[PDB]
Amino acid sequence: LSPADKTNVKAAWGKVGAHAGEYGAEALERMFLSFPTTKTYFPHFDLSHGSAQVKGHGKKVADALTNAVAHVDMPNALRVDPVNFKLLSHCLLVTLAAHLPAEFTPAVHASLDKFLASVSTVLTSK
Amino acid sequence: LLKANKDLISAGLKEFSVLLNQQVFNDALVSEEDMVTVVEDWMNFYINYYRQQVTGEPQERDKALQELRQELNTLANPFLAKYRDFLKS
Ligand code: HEM
Ligand SMILES: O=C(CC1CCCCC1)N(CCO)C[C@@H](O)[C@@H](O)[C@@H](O)[C@@H](O)CO
Numbered sequence: 001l002s003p004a005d006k007t008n009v010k011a012a013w014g015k016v017g018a019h020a021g022e023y024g025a026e027a028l029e030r031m032f033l034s035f036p037t038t039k040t041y042f043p044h045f046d047l048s049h050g051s052a053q054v055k056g057h058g059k060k061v062a063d064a065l066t067n068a069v070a071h072v073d074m075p076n077a078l079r080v081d082p083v084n085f086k087l088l089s090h091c092l093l094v095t096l097a098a099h100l101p102a103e104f105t106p107a108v109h110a111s112l113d114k115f116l117a118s119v120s121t122v123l124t125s126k
Numbered sequence: 127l128l129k130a131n132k133d134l135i136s137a138g139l140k141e142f143s144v145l146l147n148q149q150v151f152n153d154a155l156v157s158e159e160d161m162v163t164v165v166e167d168w169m170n171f172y173i174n175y176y177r178q179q180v181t182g183e184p185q186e187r188d189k190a191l192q193e194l195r196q197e198l199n200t201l202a203n204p205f206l207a208k209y210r211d212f213l214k215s
Contacts, residue, residue: 034163086154090164097171106141106175114148121153 001118006072008111012096013069015103020066023095024058030091031084041081061088068119075122082124089116130181131190138176139197142168146205151212161209169198 016023032039032047039047046053064078071077093113097104104112145168156164173195180187 034167035160083155083157083160086156087160090167094167094171097174101174101178104171104175106138106145106172109171109175110141110145110148113145117150117154124155 001114002111005111005114008108009069009072009115012100012103012108012112013066015100016096019099020062021055021059023092023099024060024062024065025055026058027061027088027091027095028054028058030094031087034091035087038084038087041084061092065092065119072115074119078122085120085123086117089113089120092116128182128186128190131186134176134179134181135190135194135197138172138194139201142172142198143201146201149205151209158210158213162206165202165206169195169202172198 013020029049045051068074068077093109093116096112097109173191176194177191180190
């Protein structure tokens with residue numbers, strides 16, 4: 001849970017800045033595409049492209065992530081099968097790396113993976 | 127071959143594998159099918175970054191991302207057999 005890591009995270013996200021929400025949704029979308037079967041657990045929600053629920057839940061996962069960044073006290077910061085959270089994170093990475101191909105060096109990437117794999121855990125360790 | 131490149135690969139293969147290692151099979155409850163997709167998403171990222179760093183001529187460059195893409199393969203396959211058999215434990 002390295003300190004170097006900590007520097008990479010703040011940096012990367014700060015670069016994201018004004019696009020957290022957009023990226024939140026985009027991530028969810030990649031999940032539903034790269035992990036089709038993920039949709040299955042959801043038949044009472046709009047999972048269509050541009051759904052408002054997804055746009056809403058993207059903003060949620062973003063804002064959340066931002067906080068979880070300030071307090072890097074995440075389990076002091078803050079049903080649904082766990083795997084969704086594990087996979088969301090994965091896509092979240094992909095999304096970031098695709099929008100910031102410059103900022104994401106094989107290291108910053110790994111440093112984020114770890115970071116998201118924890119936020120992932122503090123959620124489903126719940 | 128061309129050194130700059132050759133080295134860039136060594137640097138990669140390591141950084142990649144550092145990532146593989148930072149993966150705790152328990153903490154991340156995922157599927158065989160899914161994991162394959164994930165390592166897939168990972169190497170693509172690597173071939174993307176390193177392609178940005180690779181240097182020079184085409185016959186020499188794109189050729190490099192060949193090895194880079196293979197040596198990554200060669201690393202992932204094992205890591206996959208692990209998780210394969212890990213899930214089945
Ligand atoms: C860090 C990310 C997340 C945060 C902060 C978060 C937050 C929330 C919040 C605050 C609610 C209450 C929402 C409301 O009606 O305003 C909620 C509900 C819900 N969330 Fe999440 N969520 C996250 C990730 C996810 C993921 C990855 C999934 C699954 C794909 C998911 C599935 C659901 C579902 C199914 C509900 C049901 C709400 C209802 O029945 O009205 N969430 N989430
Ligand atoms: O279920 C969701 C969102 C989706 C769950 C499946 C995976 C993608 C997201 N809900 C349930 C509440 O009705 C949505 C809330 O998070 C949103 O409804 C809310 O923010 C949104 O509708 C505002 O327009």
